[PDB]
């Protein structure tokens, strides 16, 4: 039931900001450590393609589990405008 | 960041279905969310969907007037709103979101839907 | 079926604080963390705070959420003109299915 759901999505955050306030930043230029409230992203390396795991509070997570969500850091270290999702959503 | 179906005009006791399309890709994955405005007044919930998956969702005392559904290729996802009413002349907001009970970070223009004989 | 924000109004000098009170029961607010939209005049409405007062991008740290453990709290805590507007609360509910708001603060700076 969606109440579950929306919990888990509140747990997967607050879960994702204390792992990023264990975090401490990396000595050269890179793309934030965030929270984006859809996935968790680590810090980037410049001007790299991060992955990130295929988040748990979404449901049908099991067949996705393994996968991942690639979103591009910019040659700033800014964290770019899009994200490229499918490895963690595929229901069919 | 979702171009919604544009404003309808429609007398009581009727049904309307106003459309919100979303990005040819990047939808199935995260949870649409219906909220509607009177004119004037403060927000109202309806219900949420995550397109692909399971059945819509809804709040109570829209008991058989409010379908929420998403279609696969067109990437849009419709409401429909049956016995129509005053009270329900509004704008209706379409906001997307990680999942139905979160908060919602994108919106919607809004499609104005107004109500008189 | 409303979480009733206290105010129909706020009042606010440039510079100062201004703080939005939102009343609720225990199966909305006190189950759950109150979100908190801004919307503009002739506008929609905006993500200001989500989750009891962490916030989105570009959003200054101007703005702060509270406990939730009766009724929440925004504090806008320098105010600016830009800053006038409807602000809706919004949480949760355990008791009856979905996600309720509350009746919205229309805030007012002075000319």
């Known amino acids: 039931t969606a109440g579950e759901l929306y919990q888990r999505w509140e747990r997967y955050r607050r879960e994702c900001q204390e792992t990023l306030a264990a975090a401490e930043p990396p000595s050269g230029l890179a793309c934030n450590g965030s929270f984006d409230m859809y996935v968790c992203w680590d810090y980037a390396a410049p001007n790299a393609t991060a992955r990130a795991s295929c988040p748990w509070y979404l449901p049908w997570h099991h067949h996705v589990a393994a996968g991942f969500v690639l979103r591009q850091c910019g040659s700033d270290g800014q964290w770019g405008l899009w994200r490229d999702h499918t490895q963690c959503e595929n229901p069919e | 960041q979702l171009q919604q179906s544009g404003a309808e005009v429609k007398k009581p006791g009727s049904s309307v279905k106003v459309s919100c399309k979303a990005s040819g890709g990047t939808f199935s994955s995260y949870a649409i969310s219906w909220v509607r405005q009177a004119p004037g007044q403060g927000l109202e919930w309806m219900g949420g969907?995550?397109?692909?998956?399971?059945?819509?969702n809804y709040a109570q005392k829209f008991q058989g007037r409010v379908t929420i559904t998403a279609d696969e290729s067109t990437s849009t996802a419709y409401m429909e709103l049956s016995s129509l009413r005053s009270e329900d002349t509004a704008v209706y907001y379409c906001?997307?979101?990680?999942?139905?009970?979160?908060?919602?970070?994108?919106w919607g223009k809004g499609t104005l839907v107004t109500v008189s004989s | 079926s409303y979480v009733l924000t206290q105010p129909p109004s706020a009042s606010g000098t440039p510079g100062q604080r201004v703080a939005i009170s939102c009343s609720g029961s225990?199966?909305?607010?006190?189950?759950?963390?109150v979100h908190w939209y801004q919307q503009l005049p002739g506008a929609a409405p905006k993500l200001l705070i989500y989750?009891?007062?962490q916030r989105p991008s570009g959003v200054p740290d101007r703005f702060s959420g509270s406990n939730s453990g009766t009724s929440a709290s925004l504090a806008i805590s320098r105010l600016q003109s830009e800053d006038e507007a409807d602000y809706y609360c919004?949480?949760?509910?355990?008791?009856?299915?979905?996600?309720?708001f509350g009746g919205g603060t229309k805030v007012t700076v002075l000319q």
């Open positions: 919004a949480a949760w509910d355990d008791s009856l299915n979905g996600v309720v």
């Open positions: 225990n199966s909305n607010i006190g189950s759950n963390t």
């Open positions: 906001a997307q979101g990680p999942i139905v009970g979160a908060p919602t970070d994108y």
């Open positions: 969907i995550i397109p692909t998956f399971g059945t819509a």
């Open positions: 989750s009891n007062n």
